């Protein structure tokens, strides 16, 4: 069970319960994580990474706990930020390998074909990239990386339907190598296309779950 949360609670200012009684269980599949912007999906992803500490409940990421074991557990994990923000002075090739090398590594054979079919130009400084091309850097860095667990967060933002289809096919290919995926989409069409066993959260709680 890569992810098993039940009972999660967190108050931020104490003026914002962002979490009360949250639940989630993943087993080696693709899981949809649905809810509004203020419902606490970002807080849950940032607690799964060592970034934020929880007030209560059990969080158990790949066996260990995300807070203390935040360095040993992060090499079997890839992450795509909701807002992909990069370094303006670095080219695309140097950010797809700086990110992968500070995680679990990069597979060159997969990296070459991913660059070939996302149609990226990795000799371009990242300042000149558009938003469709800024997302491709993160997607290539995450999808060509040892990772038994992918934490995507709005993975396809700014991508034309063709690159959407390519990304869906890549996720389908990854799913049968034993890679567990979290989508957290905001676009229910791709969630319906890819994921089974969605979970819908309203305020801090999970109001619905299942296939």
């Amino acid at each position: 069970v890569p992810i098993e949360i039940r009972g999660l609670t967190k108050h931020f200012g104490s003026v914002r319960a962002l979490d009360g009684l949250d639940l989630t269980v993943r087993e080696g599949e693709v899981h949809g994580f649905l809810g509004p912007n203020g419902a606490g999906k970002s807080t849950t992803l940032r607690i799964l990474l060592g970034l934020v500490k929880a007030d209560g409940g059990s969080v158990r990421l790949l066996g260990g706990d995300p807070w203390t074991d935040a360095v040993d557990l992060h090499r079997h994990i890839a992450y795509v930020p909701g807002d992909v923000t990069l370094w303006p002075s670095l080219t695309g090739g140097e950010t797809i390998d700086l990110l992968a090398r500070m995680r679990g590594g990069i597979d060159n054979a997969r990296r070459a074909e991913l660059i070939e079919r996302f149609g990226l130009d990795p000799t371009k400084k990242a300042r000149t990239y558009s938003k469709g091309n800024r997302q491709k850097v993160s997607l290539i860095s995450a999808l060509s990386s040892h990772a038994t667990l992918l934490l995507l967060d709005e993975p396809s933002s700014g991508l034309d339907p063709l690159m959407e289809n390519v990304f869906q096919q890549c996720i389908g290919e990854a799913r049968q190598r034993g890679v567990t995926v979290l989508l957290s989409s905001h676009i229910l069409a791709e969630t319906e296309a890819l994921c089974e066993k969605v979970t819908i959260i309203r305020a801090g709680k999970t109001v619905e779950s299942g296939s």
Binding site: V52, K53, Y79, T85, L90, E94, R101, M102, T128
Partner: protein, 530 residues
């Protein structure tokens, strides 16, 4: 009803609001300290024509000061008093270049000037708005400078001449920045081109002044110095800077008229497709992030220290003997000789500059966190202390190397001046390297802030300013000797002879280490918030 200049005033008001704090600061902070700080300070130091003649002869008999500020043509109060304000031309050039590039480029680069353009604005409303803002700012600072100078007992005509010279120096570089803003899609590249033009103008003027003076006529800086305020005003050279500004404004409009809003006229150099062997960890990444700032600050501090080494010998013979000088350089500055007790003032301000350098490189940590790029780094297999050790490592090491190179340059210049370098370089290097405990603070302060109050991280700047104030306003006045210990620069000992106890160095180092440790420990247990 609509033209190519529609929305010029609305865009101007947008620009004026968007920098309603910085613009009044650098307008007042560059104009009022002309009569109240420069001329007042020469009145205090040189109260008689006899002292001013000696000062003018000193200036004219030293290539370093005649290159850093220019020559002095007579010993009037105004001329000698304004010979040192001459760097205000370079400062107004820097300010107007930054303003124009900020409000023309870096506003297209962020996509804001396509949302603007999609409104009812003309094709030349952005360029005209920014040009008008910078021309108005230059005219305002020149007028305020002239108004301040006219409240003193100096030549009334020279005050107006210097104010107009400052305004024209601002306008010429407003024009050059407007030209450069059309040259590249990158704001950094346009800033680099504009500042390279400013730097080569400064170099031409400096080489000319420390020589026959012919080459100095080929630089827009230098047209401002050759107006000769208080030394016989040549008003006809002001229209020599008006023609250049007009030609460059016409060229800027011509370049704007034949390029699209997104980008123009220079493609960018591609780069590399793989992240070398060094981009594999936070240290190699922060080296790439910081090396430009390290190079710039280190070159600046080396050039700055190289200035003092030649303005030490030749600073005994010429001061107000038994005046505030010779009674100030002793108390703030350590008692003893007058050459040795002056390196302690040059380097206790090459240490303040290095402290600002350190604060910038440590605030890059807060920039990385709030820019959403630290949760990308810390979502990898990067320790929370391994990050924040790269930015600390380069902040501290860059401050140390910049201060040590400043000391080496100053010692080399001083030794070349007085006969032999082998006897003066070690003392100057010691004076430089003893400032390190007080420049590594304000890196410990910023780290302590980033970890215990991340949103109150930039206030470190104020703390630095506070220290500077507590060093000046307090050590030049009869302020009590119990709140003068609250800033670290007064406690730096002096190397040479004796009275070198090395105890405050240890206390400052311990304070720095304790603050860094508190910052790291409080970052390791803190929510990375964005």
């Amino acid at each position: 009803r609509g033209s190519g200049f529609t929305g010029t005033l609305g865009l101007l008001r947008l620009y004026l609001r968007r920098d309603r704090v910085s613009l009044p600061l650098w307008v007042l902070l560059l104009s009022v300290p002309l009569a109240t700080v420069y001329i007042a300070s020469v009145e205090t130091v040189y109260p008689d024509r006899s002292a001013r003649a000696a000062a003018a002869a000193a200036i004219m008999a030293s290539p370093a000061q005649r290159a850093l500020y220019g020559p002095v043509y007579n010993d009037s109060l105004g001329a000698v008093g304004i010979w040192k304000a001459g760097m205000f031309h370079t400062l107004i050039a820097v300010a107007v270049i930054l303003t124009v590039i900020r409000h023309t480029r870096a506003d297209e680069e962020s996509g804001r000037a396509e949302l603007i353009d999609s409104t009812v604005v003309g094709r030349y409303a952005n360029l005209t708005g920014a040009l008008l803002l910078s021309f108005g700012a230059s005219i305002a600072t020149g007028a305020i400078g002239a108004l301040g100078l006219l409240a003193t007992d100096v030549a009334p005509a020279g005050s107006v001449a210097f104010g107009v010279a400052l305004a024209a120096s601002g306008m010429v570089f407003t024009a050059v920045a407007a030209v450069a803003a059309q040259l590249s899609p990158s704001a950094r590249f346009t800033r680099a081109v504009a500042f390279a033009v400013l730097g080569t103008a400064f170099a031409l003027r400096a080489i000319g002044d420390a020589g026959s003076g012919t080459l100095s006529w080929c630089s827009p800086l230098g047209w401002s110095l050759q107006v000769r305020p208080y030394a016989g005003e040549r008003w006809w050279v002001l229209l020599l800077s008006l023609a250049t500004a007009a030609v460059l404004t016409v060229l800027a409009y011509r370049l704007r008229a034949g390029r699209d809003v997104g980008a123009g006229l220079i493609a960018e150099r591609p780069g590399a497709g793989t992240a070398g062997p060094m981009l594999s960890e936070p240290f190699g990444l922060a080296w790439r992030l910081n090396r430009g700032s390290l190079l710039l600050w280190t070159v600046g501090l080396c050039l700055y220290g190289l200035v003092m080494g030649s303005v030490v010998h030749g600073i005994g013979d010429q001061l107000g003997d038994n005046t505030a000088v010779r009674d100030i350089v002793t108390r703030m500055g350590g008692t003893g000789a007058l050459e040795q007790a002056f390196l302690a003032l040059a380097f206790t301000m090459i240490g303040m500059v290095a402290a600002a350098f350190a604060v910038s490189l440590t605030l890059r940590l807060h920039q990385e966190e709030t820019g959403l790029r630290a949760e990308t780094l810390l979502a990898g297999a990067v320790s929370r202390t391994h990050w924040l050790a790269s930015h600390l490592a380069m902040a501290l090491a860059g401050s140390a190397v910049a201060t040590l190179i400043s000391g080496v340059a100053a010692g080399l210049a001083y030794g070349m001046t007085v006969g032999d370098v082998g006897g003066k370089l070690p003392t100057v290097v010691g004076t430089a390297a003893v400032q390190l405990p007080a420049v590594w603070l304000l890196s410990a302060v910023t780290v302590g802030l980033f970890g215990l109050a991340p949103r109150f991280t930039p206030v470190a700047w104020g703390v630095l300013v506070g220290f500077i104030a507590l060093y000046l306003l307090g050590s030049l006045a009869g302020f009590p000797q119990m709140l003068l210990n609250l800033e670290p620069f007064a406690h730096i000992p002096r190397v040479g002879g004796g009275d070198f106890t090395a105890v405050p160095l240890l206390w400052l180092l311990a304070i720095d280490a304790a603050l860094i440790t508190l910052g790291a420990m409080a970052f390791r247990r803190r929510d990375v918030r964005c």
